[PDB]
Amino acid sequence: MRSIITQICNGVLHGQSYQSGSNDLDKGNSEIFASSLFVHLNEQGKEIKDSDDKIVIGYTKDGMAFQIVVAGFYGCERQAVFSFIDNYVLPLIDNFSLDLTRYPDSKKVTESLIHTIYSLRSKHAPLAEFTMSLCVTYQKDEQLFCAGFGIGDTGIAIKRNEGTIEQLVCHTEVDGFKDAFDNYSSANIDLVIERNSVFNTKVMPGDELVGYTYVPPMLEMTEKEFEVETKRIVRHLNLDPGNFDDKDPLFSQLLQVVKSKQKQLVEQAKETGQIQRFGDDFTVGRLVIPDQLLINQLRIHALSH
Ligand SMILES: [Cl-]
Ligand SMILES: [Cl-]
Ligand SMILES: [Cl-]
Ligand SMILES: [Cl-]
Ligand SMILES: [Cl-]
Ligand SMILES: [Cl-]
Ligand SMILES: [Cl-]
Ligand SMILES: [Cl-]
Ligand SMILES: [Cl-]
Ligand SMILES: [Cl-]
Ligand SMILES: [Cl-]
Ligand SMILES: [Cl-]
Ligand SMILES: [Cl-]
Ligand SMILES: [Cl-]
Ligand SMILES: [Cl-]
């Protein structure tokens, strides 16, 4: 492949966490963390399945940064999902960045990419059923932008250099549905796209993108609820920025806030001394937007292989 992958996590073994460390190639700008927040207690309140999440972070051959955040539906399909991302999604990213540069309407470019992903999934990976968000940088008018999307329940937030956190891709919930890259959702792709997230924004070097699968739901807030005709309620869920401040990286603070909450949940759960079951796979990725010097260094690195 031509893209530079600086961090990748293909699931994590039951009972284990994964901490990627930094990659010197991108000066510590990218990292992954992956832990299960699944809590499963017997009647006596004692503790009793591999992760299906995948994150990929890297840079195109042109130095443009991307993050892909994926959560598979079913354990027995995890390899099909993981393979589909490597074989079919990753190779699209360079041309997505180039098209975003070259065409006027980022929304049309992104929509077209989503249709293409659904097409390839149906032609080449029927067992790859998953939710996914992604984003890539691109250069236009001597500025740097970031565009992408999310279908399903994964999220991407950004903490800007001055400290404000905003949501780029929300966790979308649709009454009675599970919108995803799957056979079911592929019957009405444009409706799925309109009720999930597409984004395009200006970014500056040092702005920090944080992608995530599942967070404990009391850490989110409802940014919007709306009715969709096909008579269904859609909710867009954001990371509640009240749990964060301006000083530390958002990746750092998310892991802290989740850990502290999960500690409370596990303690509550044990002390009820009853059956409890809740939580899911938690995987988080960090991508700091590169400056022009690193972008150049990456382009050169990609040439030599
Ligand atoms: Cl471990
Ligand atoms: Cl399963
Ligand atoms: Cl595949
Ligand atoms: Cl590639
Ligand atoms: Cl293209
Ligand atoms: Cl646009
Ligand atoms: Cl857009
Ligand atoms: Cl399709
Ligand atoms: Cl398959
Ligand atoms: Cl430019
Ligand atoms: Cl949003
Ligand atoms: Cl849903
Ligand atoms: Cl449709
Ligand atoms: Cl706030
Ligand atoms: Cl710069």
Author numbering: 37 to 84, 88 to 269, 277 to 351
From the study:
While AMPylases from various pathogenic microorganisms have recently been characterized, the only virulence protein with de-AMPylation activity known to date is the Legionella pneumophila effector SidD which catalyzes AMP removal from the host GTPase Rab1. Here, we present the crystal structure of the de-adenylylation domain of SidD and reveal the catalytic mechanism of Rab1 de-adenylylation. Instead, the catalitic domain of SidD is remarkably similar to that of the metal-dependent protein phosphatases (PPMs), however with distinctive structural features to distinguish AMPylated Rab1 from similarly modified substrates. The finding that SidD is a PPM phosphatase with de-AMPylation activity constitutes a clear example of how L. pneumophila has adapted a common enzymatic fold and mechanism to effectively hydrolyze an unusual substrate.
